[PDB]
């Protein structure tokens, strides 16, 4: 019994959401940004993918010249990182 070689880390909902709470503290967050909805969209995925989402979100902001990032940038990033939905 047990994964004696392939050790894949998997944090809880709050645990993984904290990763976004942390890595978002450098970019201008909007007046009512919802990160809860974002973490709920990421099943299985580890913190490495979450860091990718944080980066890709800023990319989505820059193309629309957004100085303050919204939830849209993050969820669009999630869809771009996991690449499940087409």
mmCIF file of C-alpha atoms in Angstrom:
data_model
loop_
_atom_site.group_PDB
_atom_site.id
_atom_site.type_symbol
_atom_site.label_atom_id
_atom_site.label_comp_id
_atom_site.label_asym_id
_atom_site.label_seq_id
_atom_site.Cartn_x
_atom_site.Cartn_y
_atom_site.Cartn_z
ATOM 1 C CA UNK A 1 0.000 0.000 0.000
ATOM 2 C CA UNK A 2 1.063 3.598 -0.709
ATOM 3 C CA UNK A 3 2.802 5.740 -3.347
ATOM 4 C CA UNK A 4 6.424 4.806 -2.554
ATOM 5 C CA UNK A 5 7.908 6.679 -5.563
ATOM 6 C CA UNK A 6 5.453 9.010 -7.371
ATOM 7 C CA UNK A 7 4.718 11.522 -4.572
ATOM 8 C CA UNK A 8 2.222 14.078 -5.968
ATOM 9 C CA UNK A 9 1.409 16.908 -3.523
ATOM 10 C CA UNK A 10 -2.264 17.927 -3.284
ATOM 11 C CA UNK A 11 -3.364 20.828 -0.987
ATOM 12 C CA UNK A 12 -6.953 21.351 0.282
ATOM 13 C CA UNK A 13 -9.333 24.066 -1.044
ATOM 14 C CA UNK A 14 -8.170 26.760 1.419
ATOM 15 C CA UNK A 15 -4.556 25.517 1.196
ATOM 16 C CA UNK A 16 -4.454 25.876 -2.626
ATOM 17 C CA UNK A 17 -6.475 29.133 -2.523
ATOM 18 C CA UNK A 18 -3.888 30.655 -0.146
ATOM 19 C CA UNK A 19 -1.388 30.237 -3.016
ATOM 20 C CA UNK A 20 -3.489 32.731 -5.035
ATOM 21 C CA UNK A 21 -4.003 34.956 -1.948
ATOM 22 C CA UNK A 22 -0.180 35.133 -1.689
ATOM 23 C CA UNK A 23 0.951 35.456 -5.335
ATOM 24 C CA UNK A 24 -1.716 38.130 -6.095
ATOM 25 C CA UNK A 25 -0.380 40.601 -3.483
ATOM 26 C CA UNK A 26 2.020 42.205 -6.030
ATOM 27 C CA UNK A 27 -0.488 43.096 -8.794
ATOM 28 C CA UNK A 28 -3.236 45.741 -8.450
ATOM 29 C CA UNK A 29 -6.309 43.715 -7.419
ATOM 30 C CA UNK A 30 -9.716 45.178 -8.409
ATOM 31 C CA UNK A 31 -12.268 46.580 -5.919
ATOM 32 C CA UNK A 32 -14.231 43.298 -5.681
ATOM 33 C CA UNK A 33 -11.969 40.439 -6.858
ATOM 34 C CA UNK A 34 -13.278 36.880 -6.271
ATOM 35 C CA UNK A 35 -10.477 34.280 -5.961
ATOM 36 C CA UNK A 36 -12.787 31.673 -4.346
ATOM 37 C CA UNK A 37 -14.462 30.963 -7.712
ATOM 38 C CA UNK A 38 -10.990 30.593 -9.308
ATOM 39 C CA UNK A 39 -9.565 27.925 -6.951
ATOM 40 C CA UNK A 40 -12.816 25.932 -7.301
ATOM 41 C CA UNK A 41 -12.144 25.699 -11.071
ATOM 42 C CA UNK A 42 -8.801 23.890 -10.503
ATOM 43 C CA UNK A 43 -9.254 20.151 -9.624
ATOM 44 C CA UNK A 44 -6.139 18.021 -8.957
ATOM 45 C CA UNK A 45 -3.688 20.725 -10.198
ATOM 46 C CA UNK A 46 -0.779 21.612 -7.852
ATOM 47 C CA UNK A 47 0.679 24.963 -6.737
ATOM 48 C CA UNK A 48 3.035 25.105 -9.747
ATOM 49 C CA UNK A 49 0.032 25.344 -12.111
ATOM 50 C CA UNK A 50 -1.507 27.902 -9.713
ATOM 51 C CA UNK A 51 1.614 30.106 -10.014
ATOM 52 C CA UNK A 52 1.194 29.810 -13.795
ATOM 53 C CA UNK A 53 -2.404 31.063 -13.478
ATOM 54 C CA UNK A 54 -1.162 34.108 -11.496
ATOM 55 C CA UNK A 55 1.345 34.933 -14.276
ATOM 56 C CA UNK A 56 -1.091 34.306 -17.160
ATOM 57 C CA UNK A 57 -3.697 36.534 -15.444
ATOM 58 C CA UNK A 58 -1.322 39.510 -15.706
ATOM 59 C CA UNK A 59 -0.802 38.640 -19.393
ATOM 60 C CA UNK A 60 -4.595 38.844 -19.938
ATOM 61 C CA UNK A 61 -4.576 42.211 -18.141
ATOM 62 C CA UNK A 62 -1.756 43.674 -20.296
ATOM 63 C CA UNK A 63 -3.522 42.875 -23.617
ATOM 64 C CA UNK A 64 -6.561 44.875 -22.354
ATOM 65 C CA UNK A 65 -4.199 47.481 -20.763
ATOM 66 C CA UNK A 66 -5.799 46.597 -17.393
ATOM 67 C CA UNK A 67 -3.903 48.232 -14.502
ATOM 68 C CA UNK A 68 -6.119 46.513 -11.893
ATOM 69 C CA UNK A 69 -6.598 42.759 -12.452
ATOM 70 C CA UNK A 70 -10.085 41.208 -12.120
ATOM 71 C CA UNK A 71 -11.436 37.664 -11.653
ATOM 72 C CA UNK A 72 -11.829 37.294 -15.458
ATOM 73 C CA UNK A 73 -8.060 37.369 -16.026
ATOM 74 C CA UNK A 74 -7.542 34.542 -13.478
ATOM 75 C CA UNK A 75 -10.345 32.237 -14.756
ATOM 76 C CA UNK A 76 -9.219 32.833 -18.374
ATOM 77 C CA UNK A 77 -5.734 31.881 -17.123
ATOM 78 C CA UNK A 78 -7.068 28.677 -15.477
ATOM 79 C CA UNK A 79 -8.723 27.625 -18.765
ATOM 80 C CA UNK A 80 -5.434 28.420 -20.569
ATOM 81 C CA UNK A 81 -3.288 26.467 -18.051
ATOM 82 C CA UNK A 82 -5.399 23.295 -17.631
ATOM 83 C CA UNK A 83 -6.585 23.401 -21.293
ATOM 84 C CA UNK A 84 -9.529 21.056 -20.550
ATOM 85 C CA UNK A 85 -12.346 23.023 -22.206
ATOM 86 C CA UNK A 86 -11.313 23.108 -25.916
#
